[PDB]
Design a binder for this molecule. Structure first.
Ligand SMILES: [Mg+2]
Ligand SMILES: [Mg+2]
Lengths: 255, 34, 267
């Protein structure tokens, strides 16, 4: 399980170097698609150096299939592109190594803050040399919830709003960064207790769900099942906050 | 691009927003070095 | 050259930021010490405050200082005030989330004169002085170029200390979410204002802010081409803790959008 993660972090580092080195140029969505494509190119071409047969799933061209269909590689060289558009330095590359339909390795890497969270079954979730723990919460008092708004699917918003409302009457505060993968990485390092999102897509949160799970946490769809892999209505965290949040959010189900 | 020309007074806030600083000294150019 | 008070303030901010960063890597020493309704004041806040005050007293033993902790320490020359937040978003620090900043502003005769905010993690230093403008590590700051509500990113803070208005706020939130593009919720009004100055957010609004938090950002956005106002265009914000700011056109659109949803308590 070492060499897979080895190639993973290699491609991650090269992609982050490219993204940052480019980010040092001025401007005031052409450029972001340009750099997204260039990062994907460097990523995949560095990949084909080893196992040019695993099936890559990007976020743009569906599933770039391969001849060794035992391993899928979920890729997003940029998440929450809005950030890189508007100069806000919060974005990370997300690589996920999945097998047989489930995921085994995951690496999220923020170039700006130079953070790098690795995760794999059993061997845990590390931050450049840290046995992560998740948060320590057991309730929804003095807690933080990394939220997310449907900036493409505003129809839920209303009931979503209701959730927010009720959540605000229960929790302590909210966050919003736009990089769902970074929200997941933050709940992995316990930087924020609970995470939830309405209608996400596997290419982004594939690595992040593996992160939060490996860090002693658990994920779920809005209705407690596991159709999140196809529905992306994520709710994740350590079981304590997950219960404390689901108990109050399920009663407003609309998906 | 546009299709209309809006026009109205400007609050001091608006004017200051247009600004790039607050000129203080009337003097324009050094003569010993232009 | 450079503005003198600005220079001494940025020295203070550098020292304070270095102290905070140095303590950020030992979460076993900084504990959670709550003050009000989820406004922690850890000992590290006290240490940074003391460091800043000491560094100032060297160069102005006579200037009255204001601080959320020590209230108002009077000075023999109280025409000039030093407003400080040694830490903004104490919650973001206790969760060890690496997004916070120290804020130092100097008012003269009531009107804010200079301001600085410092994020040690990303190592970003938003400086601003009236009559010279705003700088981010050497780059001028002209805010967002937005002129509508579409594609606009709105940074905001929630009244998680004045939750009575929650519904109201949430109400307007919904309204906003019908026109804007996306929200941002970072947890430090100073840094949010700074981002407004850097155009990294197309605008900002908040309810229930202490007078010692926007004083370091309102001048920032002002000399950053943006504008601030209360929820109605007046100037009672300095007392209501209700701020709305951004580039002028976006501020106009936001005010015209919010004026209806507004609960008449804030008016
Ligand atoms: Mg992406
Ligand atoms: Mg403070």
């Amino acid at each position: 399980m070492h060499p897979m993660l080895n190639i993973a972090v290699r491609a991650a580092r090269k992609a982050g170097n490219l993204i940052a080195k480019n980010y040092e140029t001025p401007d005031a969505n052409d450029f972001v698609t340009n750099v997204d494509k260039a990062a994907e190119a460097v990523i995949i071409d560095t990949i084909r150096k080893s196992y040019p047969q695993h099936t890559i799933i990007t976020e743009e061209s569906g599933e770039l299939e391969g001849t060794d269909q035992d391993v899928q590689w979920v890729i997003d060289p940029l998440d929450g592109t809005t950030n890189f558009i508007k100069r806000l330095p919060h974005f990370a590359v997300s690589i996920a190594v999945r097998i047989k339909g489930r995921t085994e390795v995951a690496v999220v890497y923020d170039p700006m803050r130079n953070e790098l969270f690795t995760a794999t079954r059993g061997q845990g979730a590390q931050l450049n040399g840290y046995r992560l723990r998740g948060s320590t919460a057991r309730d929804l008092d003095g807690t933080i919830l990394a939220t997310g708004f449907p900036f493409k699917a505003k129809q839920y918003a209303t009931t979503y709003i209701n959730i927010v409302g009720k959540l605000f009457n229960e929790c302590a505060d909210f966050r919003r960064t736009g990089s769902a993968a970074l929200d997941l990485a933050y709940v992995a390092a316990g930087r924020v207790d609970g995470f939830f999102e309405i209608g996400l897509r596997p290419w982004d949160f594939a690595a992040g769900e593996l992160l939060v799970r490996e860090a002693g946490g658990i994920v779920s769809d809005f209705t407690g099942g596991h159709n999140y892999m196809l529905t992306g209505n994520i709710v994740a965290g350590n079981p304590r906050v997950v219960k404390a949040m689901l108990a109050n959010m399920r009663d407003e189900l609309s998906d | 691009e546009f299709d209309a020309i809006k026009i109205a007074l400007a609050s001091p806030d608006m004017i200051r927003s247009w600004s790039f600083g607050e000129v203080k000294k009337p003097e324009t150019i050094n003569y010993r070095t232009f």
